[PDB]
Amino acid sequence: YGSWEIDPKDLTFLKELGTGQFGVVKYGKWRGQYDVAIKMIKEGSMSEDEFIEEAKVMMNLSHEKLVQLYGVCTKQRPIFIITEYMANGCLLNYLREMRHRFQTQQLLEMCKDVCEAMEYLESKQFLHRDLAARNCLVNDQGVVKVSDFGLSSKFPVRWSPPEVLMYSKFSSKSDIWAFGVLMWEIYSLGKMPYERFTNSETAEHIAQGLRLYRPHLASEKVYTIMYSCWHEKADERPTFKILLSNILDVMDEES
Numbered sequence: 341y342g343s344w345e346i347d348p349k350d351l352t353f354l355k356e357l358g359t360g361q362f363g364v365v366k367y368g369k370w371r372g373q374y375d376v377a378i379k380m381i382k383e384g385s386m387s388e389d390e391f392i393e394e395a396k397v398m399m400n401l402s403h404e405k406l407v408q409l410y411g412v413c414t415k416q417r418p419i420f421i422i423t424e425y426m427a428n429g430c431l432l433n434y435l436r437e438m439r440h441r442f443q444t445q446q447l448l449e450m451c452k453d454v455c456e457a458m459e460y461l462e463s464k465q466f467l468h469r470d471l472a473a474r475n476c477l478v479n480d481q482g483v484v485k486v487s488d489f490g491l492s493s494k495f496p497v498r499w500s501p502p503e504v505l506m507y508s509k510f511s512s513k514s515d516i517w518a519f520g521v522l523m524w525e526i527y528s529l530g531k532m533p534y535e536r537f538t539n540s541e542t543a544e545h546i547a548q549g550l551r552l553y554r555p556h557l558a559s560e561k562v563y564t565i566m567y568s569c570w571h572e573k574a575d576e577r578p579t580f581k582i583l584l585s586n587i588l589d590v591m592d593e594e595s
C-alpha cells in the first residue's frame with residue numbers, strides 16, 4: 341500500500357473506546373504526538389485481500405466531513421486501520437446524551453456537515469449505501485463526519501426508500517432518502533425511526549406512503565428539506581448539492 345503503510349512501532353495505545361462494528365477500536369498516538377483511532381480488524385470476520393477495495397476507496401476518497409484514513413498496518417495480523425480520532429464518538433450516542441442541551445442551530449450544523457460529505461461522495465459517483473447516525477462520528481469541536489463509507493435482519497430497512505425495499509434499486513436517490521432519515525435522527529435527538537414498528541411493518545407502511553413525522557425541534561422549513569428526500573418517485577428527490585443549498589438558506593434565515 342506504499343505511503344499508506346504505517347509502521348506499527350509508531351503506535352501507542354491509550355484507551356479502548358469500545359467494540360465498534362467490525363472489531364476493537366482504541367484511542368492512541370502516532371509517533372507519540374498525533375491523536376489517532378486504531379481499529380483492529382476481527383479475524384476472518386470480514387474477508388480477503390479482494391475486500392481491501394474498501395482501502396482503495398478510503399485511500400482515494402477524502403473530504404473535511406469524511407472520517408480520514410491515515411494508514412493501515414497490513415504486514416501482520418490482526419490488521420490495524422489508523423484513522424482520524426473523533427473525540428465525541430458515535431453521532432447516535434452523542435445525540436442521545438441529554439446533557440448537551442442542543443440548540444436547533446447546532447442540529448442544523450450537524451445536518452450541513454453530513455450533507456457536505458454526501459455532496460462530495462455524490463460528486464465522486466460514490467454510493468455510501470449505509471448512511472445513518474450510527475455511521476457518523478463527532479470530533480472534539482462538535483463537527484460531524486461520515487464514516488464506514490461504502491463498507492458493505494441487519495439490513496438498514498428504516499433508512500431505505502421503497503424502490504430499494506421492493507426492487508433492490510440502489511442509486512444516489514436511495515442515499516438522498518437515507519439522508520432525510522438521518523436528518524430526522526438528528527432532530528429527534530437519536531430516536532429510532534418508526535420506533536413503534538418492526539422492520540417488516542416499516543417496509544409495508546413505507547410502501548403505503550407513511551412518512552416520519554416532523555420532530556418537535558424541526559421547523560417547518562427544516563422539515564420540508566428532510567421531507568423532500570422522501571418523494572415516492574426517486575427522480576423527484578433533490579441532489580445533495582440542492583440539499584446543501586437548502587440547508588445553507590435555512591441557516592441564513594433561521595440562524
Ligand SMILES: C[C@H]1CC[C@@H](c2nc(-c3ccc(C(=O)Nc4cc(C(F)(F)F)ccn4)cc3F)c3c(N)nccn23)CN1C(=O)C1CC1
Nearest residue numbers: 358360365377379394395421424425426429430433488491
Ligand atoms: C461504536 C463505538 C465504538 C467505536 C467508536 C469509534 N469507531 C471509530 C472508527 C470508525 C470507523 C473506522 C474505520 O476503519 N472505518 C472503515 C474501515 C474500512 C476498511 F478498513 F475496511 F476498509 C472501510 C470503511 N470504514 C475506524 C474507527 F476507529 C472511531 C474513531 N475514528 N474515533 C473515535 C471513536 N471511534 C465509536 N463508538 C462510540 O463512540 C460509542 C459511544 C461510545
Ligand SMILES: CN(C)CCCC(=O)N1CCC[C@H]1c1nc(-c2ccc(C(=O)Nc3nccs3)cc2)c2c(N)nccn12
Nearest residue numbers: 343344345346370374375376402403408409410411412422
Ligand atoms: C501535519 N500532520 C498532520 C502530518 C504528520 C502526521 C502523520 O504523518 N500521521 C498522523 C497519523 C498517522 C500519520 C499519517 N497521516 C497521513 C495522512 C494522509 C492524508 C491526510 C489528508 O489530509 N489527505 C487529504 N487528501 C485530500 C484532501 S486532504 C492527512 C494525513 C498518512 C498517510 N497517508 N500515510 C501514512 C501515515 N500517515
